[PDB]
């Protein structure tokens, strides 16, 4: 009776996509982390750990600002990589920031330390 | 003819696991002087790798002047990748034998086709940690260079 | 549309030659004007398919030695022959028309053996097709050893007789115009390969610093002869070889390329590497493909060589910076037909083309640039011609290019390399004059 | 000792480690001839079955689809190929037809004494097939009764009827006048009565030195007769064809 | 010694 | 136009090379030596511990000479290896 | 192009020169220091 | 990186992006692009892949010189470079035409080791970071990276048993492990293997 | 059964060690012995590698 009649239907059976945690518990843990970071910053400031005493002045100041800009800058670049920016644009912005940023940072560290 | 359920052809964007697609084919009969729409209720479409992953009976959708058109109401491609065959083998005793085959590759999901980290509630705790760490690191560097021992 | 019947044909003699892989036709035509108005034009009739497959078309006087102006016009199609000086209203003219088509007869038995002889079936109109009535006509077939007819007609007059390597047809003595109704189907014996180059990309590179011209040709060859029944059996091929059957066979075993005199540095490769079975003799380059090319098989390959620039490039007399190059359009095997030719000439970087001309009509011409081994700037000037139906030894003309190349452009290339190196050196100096110490 | 080191290194490099495997010196260029034939005279969407050793090269030089290659990540698939290459031609036909195969490519060095041909690898193919399917493919049936691995008139009847054997030694005794060939890799003599015919495959290409042989799976019969019976029908003309009697067929369904 | 049968 | 150009081409002198190909290998081998000498000297000048206003001057002149030589020898060597420019 | 014997001679010459110069360097480094 | 070819392992295909070490192809393509656009030399890709290994033999020689200079001195390094330049055990798999994973791997390996030595005896964080970056390069280029993953710890472990622990050891090994481990999981063929 | 069949995964005979290293094969053990009599951390790395 094979080779001749009609064959029954077949339907694929798909697997299960992973379950995701309910949003309130994740929100609670994000609040925990935010409180922890606020704790860290206030702990630093309350103690004399960070006292902002050796602030550069004069010409060294601008070098300081260049060092700060290079540091924040790279971070910003990475954030934009996290948002969707390509890897080639990331490497090009990294080179453009890293040449003069490296010069300014080396000069700051060589003149203030 | 098979295509995406929306209507996009295969060549505009090749297939991919768990996609939605539609298949259609027309049949006509010769009675000696004319070509007339053929009406049958037991034609079947198969999607096979070596074994039939799908086997679906076709329903009539739209008659033309000479050809009756059958379709497979939109279905979902399996979650397995590989080279599949879309096949219509109309082999019924007493009539001519019909064979339509199409060999097409069904691809895996790309790296930029998964859901992003900010869309899964679980990752929310892990992004926050990383984000907080980076901010603290910046403050630490500043506070390190602006303090005196 | 029909051209006005200003002429009448005293006599019509059509001889078709089938010796080569293309059809050659010579018409002996005697014409006299039948109107009182003087007319300097004559029109030639061609069927749509024959018109598309026409490669070469020319005409002259049976007495003079120079050619008239014969141009194709673009569903019988027409070619126009122009007369230098007008004719009397009633006077005789003796024309000789020659044409070469890109078509050939298909094998009548499509599948034959490795050693069997081949026969081809060719279909052409039997009575003279023309737009001017003819009062005498004749047809002849030459080039083969045996001629037969496929489904001959009952009427005795519409039949032919054999001579030595010849086949004459009926000497009819009154034909009306546009009488292309009966179609003749002839079967003849052609036991040679039918070579067909589906695409040729011929690249000529000119260099003033080295004083060399380099030719690189990429062939895409096919064999339109009978297919092999029973498939290929290397044993049978070897038993044919060792039997010393050097008979004219219809598969390609060795090609003979005819190169310009004085060529050097020959090479023969294909898409998979370098082929070692090639041998150079004076003016000739013999080539053996990886496998014999039987009916229906393809082979895409590449040949190349070098020549002295002083044979193709001359200097203008008014200034030492205007050059004229005369470059051959085809350098290939003896009996071959081409279906698409893209001929590219590469002039040096600073060259500005001033004048161009081709001896045969082309389908396209274009000018662009392309970068090469030391082209830091825009690159070599690429001048490309596109031709359609070309035949091996009837398209023997030469393309003429007149360009300008000042000494500034000659010396600017080492200068560009020097600027690159100097920039790198300045960069090294800059990198070694700043400290990154902490 | 330093200078001698230099000399020894140069000699070892020039002698042992400076030869490609796709061209053999003598030149013998039979791999690139059959690969370029596959690339020029076969449909672009064509599947070529062969042993896994020659996977990459095909995909790199013939530019056709393969079933296995050197990146041996799935072993069941390789076992399927080796079982097709180690079974009678009917079983091999069914297997290779299920996988939509068009061409089969074998390597044979019996004429020039290559040595790295397919027969040498046969016992390995067999071992893998045996591993996946122990009760269908038995290595002991490819030896003689005394334990020899022969290909002459003393070869076992299972080795004689395998696909690789008939696809390697076809038309080989007729290459020599008199009908007595010598396998230069095995030093055994082959007679035109040793090689049985192929009824399910057709030779489409043999390289100039017989190193690479490409066969094509023939299409099935329109009437539904087995390809074996079409072959017997061609190889047999008898006046008294058979008796009247009756078929032992079963009930029509 | 290559990635090939022996 | 074809006629006139043909007549011109067939009534003119041939191409005479600037420097013959057979000579260019020697010129390349000599210019490579000159380039090596000059450049290697300018690297010595870079290593020199003298003032900056004079190191710049010497380096620039030496590089402006070595680069001309290196370009010429690049052309000659490329032509001599079989890669015509 | 270059031949096979020529490339062999070139490789051997490069090796011999390299070994001789490393020996001279080692002798000067060990003797003068 | 997202390549799926339907011309190998016919009915199944192969996900070639995530089952392949993409370092060799990436380096060859970068060299091709740099020759074609920055030097104005459009060399055929086939020739690039053919001459890849003769080009990196010299870098392997230089890295062996540096490593041996880190061991004994510069004269020993010159001897080691001369040896590794022409020794047949390395030439067997780096002849012009041999375009396998090792054509570059033996180079990167050496470089990694060099940096690690400079990281182990000086205590530098920068040299440990360079060692980790070239270890990532080797993980992306060749599958025998696991050798290094087992050789650098063993070393450290031995130094602990001999009583030779120092703060330089902590600095070097901890920096290398952290950075190289987090970086080696980005190759899709490796994935979560460094932890399981 | 497959890893056992590839010619690159087989043990080595002694001549192949002399074929690939002319005389470096009997300087290699001596150099390891000489690195043991002056044990530094870098040398321990070389010994374990060896
Ligand atoms: C490496 O290469 C090798 C060789 O190329 C690959 O190996 C192949 O892998 C295939 C799977 O991908 C495998 O095919 C399966 O074999 C299963 C076992 O078959 C044998 O046993 C059964 C008895 O159980 C016999 O009847 C049969 O003849 C064999 O001897 C089958 O169970 C599978 O069949 C199912 O799938 C096919 C098509 O996918 C259907 O036609 C069939 O009807 C079955 O379908 C059911 O299951 C699927 C999900 O798998 C459902 O979607 C479907 O709706 C059906 O579900 C109903 O039935 C199930 C019970 O099965 C029930 O639980 C459910 O509730 C429903 O009622 C399939 O035929 C090949 O045999 C195998 N080849 C070899 C030589 O080993 C290997 O994959 C490769 N590795 C890779 C790629 O990584
Ligand atoms: C202060 C300096 C800071 C910079 C530090 C620099 C390098 C850190 C060292 C190692 C980090 C490893 C992780 C980065 C991987 C980036 C690849 C990528 O980019 O592939 C990614 C994704 O493919 C992959 O994952 C596959 C893995 C890639 C394997 C690596 C290729 C091998 C090459 C080896 C190196 C060759 C040397 C050059 C040749 C000579 C493409 O990203 P996308 O284009 O889709 O952008 C979108 C950005 N979304 C995704 C975040 C939105
Ligand atoms: C950083 C340290 C690097 C150390 C060196 C590294 C690698 C080299 C070692 C071994 C490589 C062996 C190469 C074998 C040659 C194969 C081709 C061949 O054999 O050419 C020979 C010819 O040769 C020669 O006459 C060359 C003569 C002198 C060459 C110029 C000096 C070379 C300078 C090199 C750098 C130049 C750049 C200057 C920038 C300052 C065959 O010519 P043909 O008949 O085929 O030409 C076609 C026929 N016509 C001649 C008519 C066209
Ligand atoms: C960013 C990193 C850049 C690294 C380099 C930096 C700066 C210098 C750049 C280039 C200097 C010249 C390089 C020439 C290489 C092409 C030769 C070729 O390709 O030769 C092959 C065959 O071999 C040869 O004949 C020469 C053999 C000796 C080659 C010696 C090479 C020494 C250097 C090794 C590394 C070279 C760079 C690696 C990437 C190519 C071309 O054979 P064919 O059949 O295609 O044509 C043949 C011509 N018919 C078709 C007309 C017959
Ligand atoms: C690098 C460190 C620092 C940076 C950061 O941490 C890691 O990485 C940032 C991400 O970029 C996150 C944003 C992603 C985009 C997302 C858009 C949503 O809205 C869209 O929703 C679509 C569908 O619903 C509509 O189609 C659209 O139109 C509509 O804009 C919005 O709700 C939330 C938002 C903005 C995410 C917030 C947190 C961010 C900024 C994260 C930071 C904390
Ligand atoms: C002193 C401070 C000054 C402010 C700042 O720090 C230093 O420096 C700013 C930068 O200029 C950033 C912007 C860059 C351009 C970027 C374009 C985005 O478009 C994307 O949108 C995604 C979906 O949301 C798509 O997926 C992507 O493909 C698509 O590129 C847009 O959304 C965000 C935007 C504007 C960035 C936001 C963060 C900014 C403002 C940074 C701040 C933190
Ligand atoms: C102290 C440090 C550590 C903490 C941190 O830096 C400072 O400050 C955190 C913020 O709290 C950020 C979260 C805000 C909530 C936000 C919800 C979004 O979901 C949207 O989704 C859209 C699509 O449906 C819907 O339209 C919208 O309505 C819906 O809100 C989600 O994308 C991103 C998420 C979770 C942010 C992640 C990063 C966090 C944690 C940041 C860290 C970097
Ligand atoms: C500083 C770097 C760059 C320079 C270089 O590396 C070190 O050092 C170069 C050497 O000088 C090499 C040449 C040696 C001479 C040798 C002669 C042969 O000449 C043939 O031609 C006729 C000639 O009279 C006759 O017939 C026969 O002698 C013979 O057949 C020729 O084939 C090869 C050739 C020229 C070598 C090529 C490679 C060179 C240029 C080497 C470079 C790579
Ligand atoms: C400071 C520098 C300056 C001086 C120099 O270095 C130190 O000191 C020179 C040596 O004299 C070297 C030669 C030795 C003889 C050797 C013979 C080979 O020829 C055959 O020798 C047979 C033997 O068994 C083989 O059987 C054959 O295979 C092999 O071809 C030849 O290839 C290389 C050659 C000539 C050496 C080349 C380098 C030389 C000239 C060296 C100079 C560069
Ligand atoms: C001290 C040591 C010892 C103990 C241990 O380490 C620390 O701690 C264990 C964890 O419990 C780990 C498992 C968690 C579940 C996790 C699921 C992932 O599945 C992903 O697979 C991708 C395909 O690439 C998909 O794309 C993704 O969607 C999908 O999430 C899988 O890859 C890894 C796996 C199994 C973890 C690794 C092993 C375990 C057991 C770890 C041990 C080795
Ligand atoms: C790996 O299995 C393997 C590598 C090298 C050799 C080998 C030769 C291979 C190819 C050759 N050509 C075709 C030029 C010659 C070879 O000669 C050799 C000589 C020795 N000696 C001197 C002991 C060693 C190996 C080779 C083989 C192989 O034995 O065929 C195998
Ligand atoms: C070799 O040349 C032939 C002739 O041009 C190519 O054949 C053509 O291939 C394309 C694509 O497959 C088809 O669309 C054409 O119909 C073919 N033409 C003929 C006359 O057969 C062939 O593709 C070339 N092969 C390679 C590997 O380049
Ligand atoms: C002649 O010139 C070119 C032949 O190369 C053709 O026109 C161009 O064809 C290229 C090929 O893709 C296109 O990219 C261009 O857009 C086309 N136009 C131009 C202006 O370049 C065509 O054969 C001919 N063009 C004509 C007659 O205008
Ligand atoms: C199509 O429509 C119906 C069938 O649903 C029937 O009238 C006939 O088959 C067709 N009609 C016309 C007008 O073509
Ligand atoms: Mn390998």
Residue numbers in the entry:
A (entry chain F): 168 to 280
B (entry chain G): 270 to 418
C (entry chain E): 25 to 98, 111 to 474
D (entry chain A): 458 to 483, 492 to 718
E (entry chain P): 2 to 7
F (entry chain C): 2 to 86
G (entry chain B): 1 to 33
H (entry chain A): 67 to 262
Quote the authors verbatim.
Oligosaccharyltransferase (OST) is the central enzyme of N-linked protein glycosylation. It catalyzes the transfer of a pre-assembled glycan, GlcNAc2Man9Glc3, from a dolichyl-pyrophosphate donor to acceptor sites in secretory proteins in the lumen of the endoplasmic reticulum. Subcomplex I contains OST1 and OST5; subcomplex II contains OST3 (or OST6), STT3, and OST4; and subcomplex III contains OST2, WBP1, and SWP1.
To distinguish the effects of bound LLO and peptide on the 3D conformation of OST, we determined a separate structure of yeast OST bound to the reactive peptide TAMRA-YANATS-NH2 but in the absence of LLO. A comparison with the ternary complex structure (containing Dab peptide) revealed indistinguishable peptide pose and conformation, suggesting that the Dab residue used for the ternary complex structure had not altered the conformation of OST. Conversely, binding of an acceptor peptide alone to the apo-state engages the C-terminal half of EL5 (EL5-C) only, and does not involve TM9. This still allows the subsequent binding of LLO that now engages the N-terminal half of EL5 (EL5-N) and TM9. Peptide-primed: if the next glycosylation sequon is closely spaced, it can bind to OST, leading to engagement of the C-terminal half of EL5 (EL5-C). We speculate that this is important for the efficient glycosylation of closely spaced sequons, where there is an increase in the local sequon concentration, and a peptide-primed OST is more likely to be formed.
